[PDB]
Amino acid sequence: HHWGYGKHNGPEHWHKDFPIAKGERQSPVDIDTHTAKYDPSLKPLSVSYDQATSLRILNNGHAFNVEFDDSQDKAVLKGGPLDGTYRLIQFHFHWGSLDGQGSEHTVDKKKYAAELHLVHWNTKYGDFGKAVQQPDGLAVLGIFLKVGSAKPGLQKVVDVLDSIKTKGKSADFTNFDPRGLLPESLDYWTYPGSLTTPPLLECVTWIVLKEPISVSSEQVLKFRKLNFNGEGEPEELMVDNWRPAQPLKNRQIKASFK
Ligand SMILES: NS(=O)(=O)c1ccc2oc(NC(=O)c3ccccc3)nc2c1
Ligand SMILES: [Zn+2]
Domains and CATH numbers, the chain: 1-258 (3.10.200.10)
CA of 135 to the centre of ligand 1 (A): 15
Helix ranges (DSSP H) in the chain: 128-131, 155-160, 217-223
Beta carbon of 118 within 6 Å of any ligand 1 atom: no
- Residues with Cβ within 8 Å of residue 173, at least 6 apart in sequence: 54, 55, 56, 57, 66, 67, 160
Q: What is the 3-state secondary structure (H, E, C) of 37-83?
A: EECCCCCCEEEECCCCCEEEEEECCCCEEEEECCCCCCCEEEECCCC
Is 205 known as a binding-site position?
no
What's the CA gap between 58 and 46, in Å, rounded? 27
The technique by which this structure was obtained is X-ray
Beta carbon of 90 within 6 Å of any ligand 1 atom: yes
State CA 247 to chain mean position distance: 19
Q: Is the distance from CB of 160 to CB of 154 less than 8 angstroms?
A: no
Within 13 Å of residue 135, how many CA atoms lie on the same side as its CB? 4
User: Dmax over Cα atoms in the chain, in whole Å?
Assistant: 54
Beta carbon of 117 within 6 Å of any ligand 1 atom: yes
Determine whether 110 is exposed, middle or buried from the number of CB atoms within 10 Å of its CB (0-12, 13-18, 19+): middle
Q: Which of 177, 149, 255 lies closest to 210, judged by CA?
A: 255
Is 2 known as a binding-site position?
no
- Residues with Cβ within 8 Å of residue 67, at least 6 apart in sequence: 54, 55, 56, 57, 58, 89, 90, 173
What's the CA gap between 206 and 60, in Å, rounded? 23
Q: What angle (nearest 5°) sits at the alpha carbon of residue 4, between those of residues 217 and 192?
A: 85
What's the CA gap between 133 and 201, in Å, rounded? 8
